[model samples]
Target: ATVLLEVPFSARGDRIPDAVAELRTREPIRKVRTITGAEAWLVSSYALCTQVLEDRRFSMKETAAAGAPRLNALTVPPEVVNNMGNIADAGLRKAVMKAITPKAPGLEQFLRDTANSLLDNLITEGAPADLRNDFADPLATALHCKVLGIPQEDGPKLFRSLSIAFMSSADPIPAAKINWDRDIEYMAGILENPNITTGLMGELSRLRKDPAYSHVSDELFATIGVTFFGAGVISTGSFLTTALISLIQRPQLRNLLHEKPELIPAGVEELLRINLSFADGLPRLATADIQVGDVLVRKGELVLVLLEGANFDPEHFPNPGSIELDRPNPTSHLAFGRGQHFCPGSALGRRHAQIGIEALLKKMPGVDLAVPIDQLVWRTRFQRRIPERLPVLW
Candidate 1:
């Protein structure tokens, strides 16, 4: 029997439970072909998915197995796997955490200013502003590069090259190779410079010099940098588009958030719960046999922890379909993944979303769609979901 793929076109992650409910009632651990054409195991239950995510018996490194279930020819170098793990060495994780620390507090202020400036430019550029070009795209670009120590002026070119390296999985190897080569060179130069003193570059340079970090390889550090930039550019762009579109759909919610402004911190989290920006669910390569409900996963098989399914699971969240801005314990959403593998930049991303949403709403409480909602154009891709262009009316 073909496993039902719940597209849930109109609804978002918060409604994933409806899909899970169907799965639980029908085929619990169904076999499905991914958009990538790789057959895999998909778990929809909140408890089962979380267990799979937390269990060390499931390894991400298994994607490296030679004869294993191949997803795509490794886009990133094999050594990149050492740098990408949920259970990275505690010391390394802490050091990397510090590298991102400076971005957290400044993220809110930076996004607010960025949003306001963009809105002003949008107004000057005239109405029916394309939010992707005029706001979301540029806003994500400015904030990400600003925090990462790249020149704000370089955002467009960097974004263009980086965009190709991201968003497309059909031929991602070339993009990864291009970015990896350029980024490794760029990071090495930053370490040698006395002029640069903070952000990811500085911290990574310091880590490279420290005896405690002797275990780290330059390639690994470079991979970390690539991960941060890739994630910031892609995920932030996707979320910014979704947030803007959702607010446009509910003008009252938009006005309410604009009037209060402070509520944006809460509202953005609600938006995250609704949308769950990251496209690929957390993945695990089973190391041992495990039974998740009706489905039995064998050793070496891949398991997908669908956060969209987790966010909507009624067992974990009540009234999961509705967007409640102030829902207590709103952090339950797995938009940022969960447990040890949770996103390192979650705090910074949240602050950016919070600040950007508030500033835009406050500046343009009258914001509306330039055309009808049904007329909006969304990107046709499997890796990241976003509109081709979101035109907003002043």
Candidate 2:
């Protein structure tokens, strides 16, 4: 007999996935099947997820290989998937890192200003505005464009395509392919332009001239552009919106934040932990037989690291069901992931949410859901669970 758990266990309101808590007790490491009818090992324990993330034996490149267990029906070209973990020139990646470095002075102010500008427009539209559409999406787009030196005018068109491409894993194959092509072409156009010589895309273009990164092709640079914009916009937007939701739902914390502006960073961490951005596990594939407690995850087997489940593990986070702004290890949550694949955009993502939420609090101190909490809508098509329309009254 075999037990199979659904990929994304459903939850109501802002609560964490109930199924994850149930699995942690009985089958911390157990065999399961994905939505696409492929077999996988779901590692629900904090200890096991941490191990799999750090171990080189589990490979993302191999997991994207043909015949691998797919969590979704949509497919990416094998060539592109294989190349994700391999870069011909380390210098190019280094250049991108420097370009998007969150510590660059005034980056926080830049984000804050962008958030205020978006909120300004939302306010003009009056109360009961959809935060996800009027605020979160536009703010994320503007910030992404600002970081990459994309013209603000081009933000909407480019962001729309990236959103489709990023969330296309559940779409029809042809539709997904079209989005990929559209995104790549748009990025390539930016790479070809000579006048734009600032931000990440510009740095990547400039790096191509350096002899050290001469091996990096224009297409590769363009692909990086696509990846940066697509990944950054959606994740950051989700974090900002979700953080706002968390703050609104908990009045004690909301008033605390209003009084102590300095504790915003700590508040952001708690919000990240409580948010279910990536409730579905991160996928990896084993390169060799590895014992996870009693079960051996054999070579070529698929493994899903249940990060959200691990974050809620009682042993690691006491009273894990509730938000604690001053948790001893608030940053220990694997929301940004860990090890080799730890998200490079982690700092930027955090700063974005911190700034966005703070700005919202200051602008609309008494913000509340326009409708009953149960009346709010959510999106289930994408990997991250996001509010479809966060209707709020200030």
Q: Tens digits of per-residue lDDT for model 2 on 73-177?
A: 544565555444544335454656677767766777888888898888878889888888888878888888878877889888777764455552533466667
Q: How many backbone clashes does candidate 1 have?
A: 0
> How many pairs collide in each candidate, listed in order?
0, 0
Full-model lDDT for every candidate: 0.68, 0.78
Instruction: Look at candidate 2 and give me any clashing residue pairs.
Output: none
Model 2 lDDT on a 0 to 1 scale: 0.78
Model 1 CA lDDT for position 131: 83
Candidate 1, poorest ten consecutive residues by summed lDDT: 6-15
The candidate maximizing TM-score is 2
Off by over 4 Å in 2: 1-3, 11-13, 82-84, 168-172
TM-score of 1: 0.88
Report the number of the highest-lDDT candidate: 2
